[PDB]
Amino acid sequence: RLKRIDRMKTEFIANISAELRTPLTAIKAYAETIYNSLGELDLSTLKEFLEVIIDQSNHLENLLNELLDFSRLERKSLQINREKVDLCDLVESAVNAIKEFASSHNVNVLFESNVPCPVEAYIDPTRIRQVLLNLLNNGVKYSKKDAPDKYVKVILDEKDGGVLIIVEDNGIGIPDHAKDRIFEQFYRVDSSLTYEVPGTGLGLAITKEIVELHGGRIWVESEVGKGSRFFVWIPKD
Amino acid sequence: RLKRIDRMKTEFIANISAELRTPLTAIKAYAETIYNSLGELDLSTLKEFLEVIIDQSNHLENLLNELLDFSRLERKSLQINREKVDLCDLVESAVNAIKEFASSHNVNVLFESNVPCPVEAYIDPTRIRQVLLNLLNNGVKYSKKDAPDKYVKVILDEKDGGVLIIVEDNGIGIPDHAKDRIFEQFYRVDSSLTYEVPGTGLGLAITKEIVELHGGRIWVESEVGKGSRFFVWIPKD
Amino acid sequence: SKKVLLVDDSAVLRKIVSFNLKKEGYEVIEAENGQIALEKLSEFTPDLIVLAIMMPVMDGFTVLKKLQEKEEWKRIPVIVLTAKGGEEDESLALSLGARKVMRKPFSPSQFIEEVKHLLNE
Amino acid sequence: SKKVLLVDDSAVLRKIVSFNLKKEGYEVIEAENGQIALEKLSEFTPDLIVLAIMMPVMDGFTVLKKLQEKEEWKRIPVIVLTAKGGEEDESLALSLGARKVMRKPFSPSQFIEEVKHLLNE
Ligand SMILES: Nc1ncnc2c1ncn2[C@@H]1O[C@H](COP(=O)(O)OP(=O)(O)O)[C@@H](O)[C@H]1O
Ligand SMILES: Nc1ncnc2c1ncn2[C@@H]1O[C@H](COP(=O)(O)OP(=O)(O)O)[C@@H](O)[C@H]1O
């Protein structure tokens, strides 16, 4: 079988190291600074520095969870458990979850429904939230570098006997040769507009697997320099 | 050709997640405790809880440096830069660096030179230190579970035109089929005596590559239930 | 005071969980593996057991199983606090009699809310 | 006071380095990316530049190169503080005229020792 090249696994291992090293650097710097500065530290600053440690720990945890979820999907032990969820709350909730990260990159996050709410669906809310956060996160990560009107927008709709979620951005966009590869495990577009962006290339492979476990599909449309639209279709019941 | 199986790569990803999750658990629990207990912590406890954060951070950093070094060995970018080093001093330094870890597992760490000291040699001291730390760490990790006389011993000697380092333990030992595979990337013995021990299966692959880069070799002798001897032979000049 | 048996192989982990349980006024008895834990039940009966899974000598799953096989041990409620992140891991623990499975990394304040809930019914 | 130009794309990182520099009485000017850093040199001449590598818009290797291309800018000492952990990364930065490369994660107290050394000699 032609498959995930050893070159891609090696890059992957390097990329793990790099993405984890940034929060770890903050954890250690903030902790040592507290320890050595307990006399020069006011209470408000002590608390602020502890909050940074905690929040960087949480980011690191999320990154570890990505690795865990990917190993669990590759072994097929990850198995869905559905419920009746209002997609409108779920999306708003996901949008709230990513607010701080989007601000940190000056990206506005929007939500529109083409259909009135609630929008009920028989889905695993945990795993669909995680699909939405991967797409929302990617819309922030791959946003334009220096632009005044950067956004990521979730569009909710009902189509073809299911729910259609579109995540649209005006980011860097994706080259045509990359488009058919972006869902593959470990695949990252390597360009002058992505060299600094941390990642493993697992997120969209996880997302694809979760969506297909729900009997749904995910596809992409993009233009380089303009932006991207990710479409997720999942059956209504 | 026949290579590093995909099941092994999946296990590896799962193992990364697990080994990193333990220090991260301590970082976040200790940080949140401090943040939520500032009225309930005396100063020596505050400082002790900060030192935990810092020391757990340092362990996580070592585990990232393993992934990094491994990626860099797989790309030939890892240069060795030799120098005249007293190995007696290097070994004592490595023995010191592991003492706390060995104590946490009730493992005594010993050093004997079969030859008078100094034992000078032309080696990269950072890379050899790291070889010694990987072997010492493994002697602790794979030590017996409940025994009053657990040890890891470094024996230094000069032989066949080079320096011979033996790391001996009275641990769990290695079964015969496993012996030909323990140096392979991602390989861990999976048994009822290893299930709780964290690791990636990269350490002896890194160690073997570093040793070959010095023009040396590494081999093992072991008996299940008795223990193991790792032999590292590197040319003196 | 309520008595909690804390079973985990990490001294670092036991220390922080013990600190948080003592903030509430609970007494704490520590065991570093599952066999040690079962041996300590010969000296006392805890109001709650906090139990890790991945321990040398005797793992948590074995502990939960042995707890169900004695009448005097079977009624003690157990919170499993574990890095074992799977749904199947959790289902196994609950089917072995655990009252609650909480994952690591954990929130100390969430953990203590759950402890209180189990101790107060 | 000595003035330090702090160049890094992480606000979290800038904050902790800034705190530790201001503990020593230094003034700190911050820059989010390499291009911003070079623009702020029209306003002042720092005594030291603390520089990351992986930044959008303009990376630290381009920054180091552009710093050597102007006589005014070329004698400002630069400590590179970076996650780039390779020997070949370090050699490249030193060949581009950095004075010192320190790896991340770093010790704040070791970093400050090196800052003081460079600011005095
Ligand atoms: N919204 C987007 N805009 C541009 N490129 C993107 C977008 N989302 C994903 N990509 C590309 O798809 C690749 C795979 O994405 P993902 O699997 O989420 O991995 P990662 O984000 O860790 O690289 C990314 O590296 C990036 O090149
Ligand atoms: N001293 C030892 N005694 C017993 N087994 C060992 C010893 N050192 C190494 N091993 C075995 O060799 C395997 C490979 O070791 P290593 O490459 O260091 O990886 P890791 O320690 O992450 O598993 C370990 O999983 C273990 O089964």
Residue numbers in the entry:
A (entry chain A), B (entry chain B): 243 to 479
C (entry chain D), D (entry chain C): 2 to 122
What does the publication say?
In order to confirm that the sulfate ion was indeed stabilized in that position thanks to the presence of the phosphorylatable His in a gauche− rotamer, we generated mutants of HK853 and RR468 defective in its phosphorylatable residues H260A and D53A, respectively, and obtained the structures of its complex (HK853H260A–RR468D53A) at pH 5.3 and 7.5. The overall structures of the complexes were similar to the HK–RRpHs but the absence of the imidazole group due to mutation of His to Ala was concomitant with absence of sulfate ion bound, supporting that the presence of the His was required to coordinate the sulfate. A second sulfate ion bound to the catalytic site of RR468 was also observed, despite absence of phosphorylatable Asp due to its mutation to Ala. The presence of sulfate ions at the active center of RRs lacking the phosphorylatable Asp has been previously reported for MaeR triggering its phosphorylated conformation.
